[PDB]
Ligand binder design. Structure first.
Ligand SMILES: Cc1ncc(COP(=O)(O)O)c(CN)c1O
Ligand SMILES: Cc1ncc(COP(=O)(O)O)c(CN)c1O
Ligand SMILES: O=C(O)CCCC(=O)O
Ligand SMILES: O=C(O)CCCC(=O)O
Lengths: 396, 396
């Protein structure tokens, strides 16, 4: 029976939406969206995907099931996006990709895989991190440990505290990294911190699980992977859960992948079969649509050229909204160096506002931010940058 | 590490496909597909969905995330498809539907819901049943009990053995029913067996979990639900996992739903929130595509009229391939009453062939059937009905 089931709490994101889409003051602003918005304040569908969809609409002849791993062309592409082209990983066939229902689905299946085929009991998530991480892992039955990361004072990657907390991890634990655009700090390890953090990762014997979901939002497709790639040079085994929900604007089509790298072809094919069984038990096979779109775009030199350009457009909008934000504040009369904002990558960053400040900002000005003072830079337009920075200063 | 992971076994369906799509004898036939095929031997995409997709292609303006429960219009529609129109269930708001990645995803989330919010430890699957059921439930951590069902001798619903085995179930167990087209027997409870089986279900206190995936393939959309509806009149709580993969031909888009019925609005909304948390932890939100298609079709009086007609077409093809099969055998010279075939509904039925017979049929004739002697009636065309029945008789 259900009558005594105790109602769940409000999600650390979703709640805002509602008080937002209710806030009688239309002059409002929402910065706790996590989704991208253009200069208009709309989340359009990429032209490349539109072209991609009409193509499929014209070409699909059946909607018969996909393999448990989804569409091959999609798999090989993500592989090349992650590890590059001449990646031995690929050439030796010690990587197997499965199309999953989004980055989350990739995480949960890597979870159910690990949690039911290996002795991995704990997964080291950083402090802070995307909130759903824990829920995902915990639902697999695994425990979520936390390694330090953010430096509240200096607004940076406290590498010391980082390696420090990690040592408390036993050889055998899965340590969860963010390929680029660390949600929610927006602070990322330099190619040098990664390399050391990778070598120190083989020595202690960590099982790396890369959450790669904002590839292309920091520096570009290639650059944004140099980290994962660094770990993938030293490690013989690893798991990477990629999400095409942001960079291809395919949010709701649930497009992502769970790549598995093992020492060699035989071991990866052996383990992957078990990864497949984890999927058949979850949702059987993946939703073709979003992936068909992503496969054709990436395999079409013309359509890919457009996509790449569209992505760089998004990257640059955000990459400039940070400056507008920072210097507009300096004009509005702020007494606080917000420069650290410019240094950060991706859609997110921590404004440095107190849970109290973020509350009066909403309550007295209609500006919505995550309780964590996390602010979505992509929800800022030149049009609202002025009143935004205004409200913020009034509450500093 | 993965190097010692022991490779998984071959799926009780998928293995065939491969020896099929390899069998050098092109005169082959595949009857262990589980998917529908037209007179051509192709799994086309419904015209209504094609029209539905061009509509969306023309109308979508964003691919922003769906609610954890997916699209509302889809939810209300499935609700009306399941419980009917004037269903108090609907009018009192004691039913909440969540768009899930297919019937399987609906099952797994009902699983993870139950397994993490109620004392339900075992789920009574029938003997036999769709093989992935167990794997789904077991992956939730719940145990799969088995109640008798098929009558190998008389090829029928052994009601006695059925109610019989069920009594060994404690008030508190989830008993898994098949709304219509029992995969794989193709044998279904009459409106009268259902009603008794429903009343005897409230008395013992079972938690009904209806796997509804072939709605429209037995008698029609309305008729095919009179069972679920019977249980939903007597019960104050129940769960139904519906799949739009067959009847809308949307196989690979993963379209399905997990409906939850509780005693009243307050309890259902309270429990459902927990069902939502189970989803956010699994894949976050559902793939919009397949569901958008299904929502518009069902909400468009014109497009729905076409869909309904297309479905009735499929229903009748299968519903006639059974006769062709039966009487062609009687002509080919069979010494065995295969009449029971005509009595059965849906795409599947048990030919009554031994695992040995099905093997020589494949090995010596290129006819593929599931080890269980299960035969997919929708893979039979007038063109291959002749050699098929021929091979079968030669092995009787
Ligand atoms: C770091 C991180 N990982 C995974 C995801 C999931 O993306 P998806 O909706 O494709 O699951 C997100 C959501 N933005 C995220 O921020
Ligand atoms: C009885 C039963 N339940 C659930 C399913 C799942 O359908 P889906 O691929 O939509 O998950 C099937 C597959 N035919 C089935 O036969
Ligand atoms: O805003 C975020 O970072 C969370 C997005 C999670 C999701 O859309 O599933
Ligand atoms: O043939 C069957 O009945 C199994 C189909 C299962 C699936 O397609 O996931």
């Amino acid at each position: 029976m259900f009558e005594n089931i105790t109602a769940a709490p409000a999600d650390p994101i979703l709640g805002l939406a509602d008080l937002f889409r209710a806030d009688e003051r239309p002059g409002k602003i929402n910065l706790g969206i996590g989704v991208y918005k253009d200069e208009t304040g709309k989340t359009p569908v990429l032209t490349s995907v539109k072209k991609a969809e009409q193509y499929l609409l014209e070409n699909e002849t059946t909607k018969n099931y996909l393999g448990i791993d989804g569409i091959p062309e999609f798999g090989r592409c993500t592989q090349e996006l992650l590890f590059g082209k001449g990646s031995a990983l690929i050439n030796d066939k010690r990587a197997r990709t499965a199309q999953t229902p989004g980055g989350t689905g990739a995480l949960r299946v890597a979870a159910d895989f690990l949690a039911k085929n290996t002795s991995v009991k704990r997964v080291w998530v950083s402090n802070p991190s995307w909130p759903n991480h824990k829920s995902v892992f915990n639902s697999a039955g695994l425990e979520v440990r936390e390694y330090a990361y953010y430096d509240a004072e200096n607004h940076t990657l406290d590498f010391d505290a980082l390696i420090n907390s990690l040592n408390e991890a036993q050889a055998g634990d899965v340590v969860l990294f963010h390929g680029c655009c660390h949600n929610p700090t927006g602070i990322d390890p330099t190619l040098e911190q990664w390399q050391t953090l990778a070598q120190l990762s083989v020595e202690k014997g960590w099982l790396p699980l890369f959450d790669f979901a904002y590839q292309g939002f920091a520096r570009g497709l290639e650059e944004d992977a140099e980290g994962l790639r660094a770990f993938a040079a030293m490690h013989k085994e690893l798991i990477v859960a990629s999400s095409y929900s942001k960079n291809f604007g395919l949010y709701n089509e649930r497009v992502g992948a769970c790549t598995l790298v093992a020492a060699d072809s035989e071991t990866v094919d052996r383990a992957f079969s078990q990864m497949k069984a984890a999927i058949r038990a979850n949702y059987s096979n993946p939703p073709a649509h979003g992936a068909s779109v992503v496969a054709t775009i990436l395999s079409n030199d013309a359509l890919r050229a457009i996509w790449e350009q569209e992505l760089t457009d998004m990257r640059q909008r955000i990459q400039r909204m940070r400056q507008l934000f920072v210097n507009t504040l300096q004009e509005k009369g702020a007494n606080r160096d917000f420069s650290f904002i410019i240094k950060q990558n991706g859609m997110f960053s921590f404004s440095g506002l107190t849970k109290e400040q973020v509350l009066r900002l909403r309550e007295e000005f209609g500006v919505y931010a995550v309780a964590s003072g996390r602010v979505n830079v992509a929800g800022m337009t030149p049009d609202n940058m002025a009143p935004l920075c205004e409200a913020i200063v009034a509450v500093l």
